[PDB]
Amino acid sequence: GNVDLVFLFDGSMSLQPDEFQKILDFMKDVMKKLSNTSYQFAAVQFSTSYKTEFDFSDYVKWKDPDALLKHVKHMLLLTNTFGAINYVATEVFREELGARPDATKVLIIITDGEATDSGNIDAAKDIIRYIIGIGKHFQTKESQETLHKFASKPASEFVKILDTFEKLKDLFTELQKKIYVI
Numbered sequence: 001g002n003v004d005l006v007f008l009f010d011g012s013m014s015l016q017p018d019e020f021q022k023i024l025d026f027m028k029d030v031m032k033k034l035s036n037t038s039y040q041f042a043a044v045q046f047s048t049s050y051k052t053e054f055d056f057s058d059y060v061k062w063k064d065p066d067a068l069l070k071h072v073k074h075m076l077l078l079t080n081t082f083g084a085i086n087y088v089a090t091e092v093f094r095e096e097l098g099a100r101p102d103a104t105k106v107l108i109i110i111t112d113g114e115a116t117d118s119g120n121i122d123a124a125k126d127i128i129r130y131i132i133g134i135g136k137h138f139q140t141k142e143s144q145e146t147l148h149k150f151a152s153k154p155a156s157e158f159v160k161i162l163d164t165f166e167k168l169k170d171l172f173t174e175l176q177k178k179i180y181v182i
C-alpha cells in the first residue's frame, strides 16, 4: 500500500562519528530494500533543534539514498524528542512537501539517549511510531521504559532496544527476513 515513512534520527553530542554513520547506513539500507515499492521517504535530524535533511518531494526526484544523505552535518547538541516528534507531525507530513493524503503514516525514531525536553505528542497520534534505542544509555530497564511513551502500542512490537550500534546490521537482517517484496 501507500506508506509515507519519516526517519527521525538523533544527532546528539553523545554520538561518535562512526556511530552516527551507522545510523545513516541503516537508513540507506532500508530505503534501498524498499526502492520500487510505493513507500516514500523523508529524514529529519534532531538534537536541540530540527532539520529536514530531505523531504518526500526530494526523494521522488532523486531516489538515491547516497545522494539524498550526502550533506548531513552532525548537530552535536541535546535530545529534544518531544519537540522533534511534533516537528515531524506538523512540518514534514504536509502535502506541500510531497506527503500523500491517502498514505499510511509511519515514523521511525532512532536515538541513543533519554529526551531532554518535556511535552506531549497528541499531534502525532495518527502516526505509527517505532523507536529504536541504542547503546549504553539504555542498559537499565527504567531508561528503556521512558521510550514507551513515544512509541505506538504495544511496546513489545514498537520499541526496539539494541545494546550496540553494530546490532543495527542485525536489525536490518530481520527486516530482510520479514518483509518480502515480489
Ligand SMILES: CC[C@H](C)C(=O)O[C@H]1C[C@@H](C)C=C2C=C[C@H](C)[C@H](CC[C@H]3C[C@@H](O)CC(=O)N3Cc3ccc4c(CO)c(OC)ccc4c3)[C@H]21
Pocket: 001, 002, 003, 005, 030, 104, 106, 108, 128, 130, 171, 174, 175, 178, 179
Ligand atoms: C517488519 C519487521 C522489522 C524488524 C520491523 O519491525 O520493521 C519496522 C521497524 C524498523 C526495523 C524498520 C522498518 C522499516 C520499514 C517498515 C515501516 C517496518 C514495519 C512494517 C510494518 C510491520 C507490521 O508488522 C507493523 C507495521 O506497523 N508496519 C508498518 C506498516 C507498513 C505498511 C502498512 C500498510 C500497507 O502495507 C497498511 O495498509 C494496509 C497498514 C499499515 C501498515 C503498517 C519498520
Ligand SMILES: [Mg+2]
Pocket: 010, 012, 013, 014, 015, 079, 112, 113
Ligand atoms: Mg545522545
